[PDB]
RNA sequence: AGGGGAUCGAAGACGAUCAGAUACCGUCGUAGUCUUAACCAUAAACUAUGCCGAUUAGGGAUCGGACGGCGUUUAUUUUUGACCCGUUCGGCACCUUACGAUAAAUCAAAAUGUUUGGGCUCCUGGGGGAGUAUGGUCGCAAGGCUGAAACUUAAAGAAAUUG
């Protein structure tokens, strides 16, 4: 049986695509098959911003950001809880999850 | 490529009727197509049809009124004697009382019943009931 | 401390059958229940009386779905015949002029239907 | 005019209320089956319904209702809040049961449910949100009449009245005109020319 | 294995009514 | 209808769909009848006089019953300029 | 045991004798939901049980066994039907099966092979039906031959009133439940075939439910 | 067979782990990985779905070309280009639906097939023995293509349901 209509790959209209290296175990997987996450974060955690802020010599200061793009194989993706098993009907839903905008 | 214009016409008619429509369009028109429609028309299975005349081959627009179950074509036009004509009506006709098998003979094309009256045989080209 | 369906179902029927005879006081409601009901346990009677007096405390401020009594019921269809003196659809009295506003191709529909004499004001609509 | 006289024309007064209630405004999405009931598409905007065909279909729907022997066999349905009051008033003026709010599926199929009915006709405010009512009608042979917008499923919908179907005023007004016609064909109003004594705003919705 | 009550059913007719010797 | 010596032998004669002509089978739930009243000269509805139509379940499921009724109603002089062929 | 109380509008009309025969119901295609309607119009309907087969279900403690029964009925004069129901008890399942069979009684159309001489004996046309990988085909036959078919489908055709026919089978016919359901669908479609003798236009009349007034 | 040989790393040597560890983990490391001139012809070489033609239902996105239109932007500025609305031809795909099809999972083809015929090529006949023995042919070799029999067995296998 086919578990997924797209074979879990997202590759139609071409024959080959160059592989990449997994960011955790350094495995080789096709680029279209890997799970990719883009992250934007601060240099320092939120508790430490005050100590840096008043120790600066530039009056008000804005700590820079850091930009990373992590990408995993599926075996390392669901062991690190990036994604998890879904139900049979819920599998065919590709909308990104609604991030919490109220936080209780 | 197009190898049987008769099959395209009969297939297109069958699809539209099965879906409950009332009119059909046929892209290529030929002498055999028109002679086939005339046999169906005289038995009430279809209505008027009109032939628009483009300079290439013309088209046909047939008017449907129900009453039609199937109309098919036999692709290899076999040779049938007069004595063995009853084998075919046993094969591809729902019942003995009604239904027609179309033949082509040297005296024009006709249904399987008129050919018996004129005592003529030939080649088989299709059927409808 | 959650009350089961027997306590809750029995409290519902008491309120609607005898609404005015019992009030917000718990002590009085205790004597109301045993007269108009058949209860085989004193503890069961106490729990039923406890819930019904709780229900009317929130009834005092706005009605609650799932509850209907004659005083609440009769008041509702008194309010449902409300009707103004001038119709909202009527526009001759409304606005500084009687004529209303439509777009261009609506007026063409009026001409097609034959009601050209209707007084309207046409404004073009296009964004692109 | 083999079966209708000329006294059934919309007249200037009835039309004047229709476009004042925004009954000629449709949605951007256009169903293929609703193409006949379209006058023009607005430049940079929505479609526009043909009010002339709205009146014509409305009279035809009313004529079907009168043919029913006893009025109690007609059932009228609504689920959305905007149509709750208009349906109930329609049931009181004529003879009909009204189903407002939840439908309790199994009403037309199960003979032991509390809300068991055996109607001869069904009138529906909105086919999309009342799909359960239409779905169960296909099991026991009842024709369906419904109010439809530019976009609406038309499975098992024999008679369609083109209308806004979503406006606050539009839903109420259409139900009012339909009630007036039913009484006109009977002897209640006694005349086409005489006006009715009930005000159109009675068939509206109130927030509390 | 529904063969226990066929001796004295008399409320239905079976396909091959078992003849008795 | 069938015959042997001129007498009918069929158990019953079924009806036909008005839109397409298909036979409406027994146990074919989803097929309905539409009865439209007949009005007199002054606008009142005549009692006992009506026009009957029948539609099969197959055409109703497709969603074509609305257009089928428009063609039949306009043909019998019940409506004006609402249905046409493009 | 004692007299029944009608629950539907159709049941009340039947009890008062306001409708002539069951074909009036068939003509307008109205649903039937009360088995007392059928036996009021069609007495001497014979019933005959086909077989009973156990069905299992695995649970933590053990296996749960239920009994499934197949029953078909007919009058040998153009009416036939079958019903299937399973229950925890053999006797209970049979009683419920007979009720379901009565609710599904349908008419059959019987025609002639060649020339007509009264009392049609065979199918009018050749018809076939499919129910889950089983296909059964029926062919009209001349007078004189008997029914040529397997014992399972010969019984169903016997109770439908059809006298002479030819049969053809395909697929896994050992599934008895599927075979009977396919035959029942083939016979049911005989009235669905439009022969040229039915081309004559018919007159539409109002249904009994609309033009009668029921009791309270 | 020459050139090149940074990085990774079959074989190999050690360190730990373990009852054992010729492995998983760690430190090294030869052929190989790259290029020029010649051989090899196999992959889950996959959409596990051959090629040409006709007909059958609704929807919104997108890549390439043409045609129509109200404006905004902008340049030695107009016509063009960027963005917006609609029509059409040709593509890689997707969502809903079942009148239809299938054992089912599911499919706009896997539909128009017991109411069975538009044209053409290749392949399969219960499970093992077996893609093995033998003969022939191609190759420097590794191997490729073609391809049995004796004997043995009542079940292997596919889709889905409850534990
Ligand atoms: Mg390509
Ligand atoms: Mg590949
Ligand atoms: Mg050398
Ligand atoms: Mg070298
Ligand atoms: Mg290294
Ligand atoms: Mg080693
Ligand atoms: Mg291979
Ligand atoms: Mg392959
Ligand atoms: Mg499409
Ligand atoms: Mg778009
Ligand atoms: Mg483009
Ligand atoms: Mg341009
Ligand atoms: Mg495109
Ligand atoms: Mg492409
Ligand atoms: Mg055969
Ligand atoms: Mg060899
Ligand atoms: Mg054994
Ligand atoms: Mg399996
Ligand atoms: Zn990894």
Residue numbers in the entry:
A (entry chain Sa): 2 to 105
B (entry chain SW): 2 to 130
C (entry chain SR): 3 to 130
D (entry chain SA): 3 to 210
E (entry chain B): 127 to 147
F (entry chain SV): 1 to 86
G (entry chain SC): 40 to 255
From the paper:
Ribosomes are complex macromolecular assemblies consisting of ribosomal proteins (RPs) and ribosomal RNA (rRNA), which catalyze protein synthesis in all cells. Here we focus on late intermediates of translation using the thermophilic fungus Chaetomium thermophilum (C. thermophilum, Ct). Using isolated 80S ribosomes from C. thermophilum, we present single-particle cryo-electron microscopy (cryo-EM) structures of an idle POST state ribosome and of a hybrid pe/E tRNA translocation-intermediate (TI)-POST state (0° rotation, 7° swiveling) bound to eEF2-GDP-Mg2+.
Interestingly, we observe Stm1 not only in the rotated pe/E (TI)-POST state with bound eEF2-GDP but also in the back-rotated idle POST state, although in a markedly different conformation. In contrast, in the non-rotated (and non-swiveled) idle POST state we could localize only two short Stm1 fragments bound to the 40S (residues 87–97 and 127–147), indicating higher flexibility in this state. Here, the extended α-helix (residues 127–154) is dissolved and residues are folded onto the 40S body instead, and the swiveling-block is released. Electron density is not visible at the 60S subunit or in the mRNA entry tunnel and the A-site, and Stm1 binding to the P-site is also altered with Stm1 folding into an open hairpin structure. In the idle POST state, Stm1 Arg94 takes the wobble position of the mRNA within the P-site and is involved in π-cation stacking with an invariant cytosine (CtC1633) from H44 of 18S rRNA. However, we find Stm1 also present in the non-rotated idle POST state, where it adopts a significantly different conformation leaving the A-site and mRNA entry tunnels empty. Here, these sites could be readily occupied by the Dom34 ribosomal subunit splitting protein in the same manner as observed in yeast. In our idle Ct80S structure, m1acp3Ψ (U1188 in Ct18S, U1191 in Sc18S, and U1248 in Hs18S rRNA) lines the P-site at the tRNA wobble position as also found in the idle human 80S ribosome. The mRNA codon wobble position is filled by Stm1. Despite the absence of the P-site tRNA, this methylation is clearly identified in our idle Ct80S structure, highlighting the level of detail resolved in high-resolution cryo-EM reconstructions.
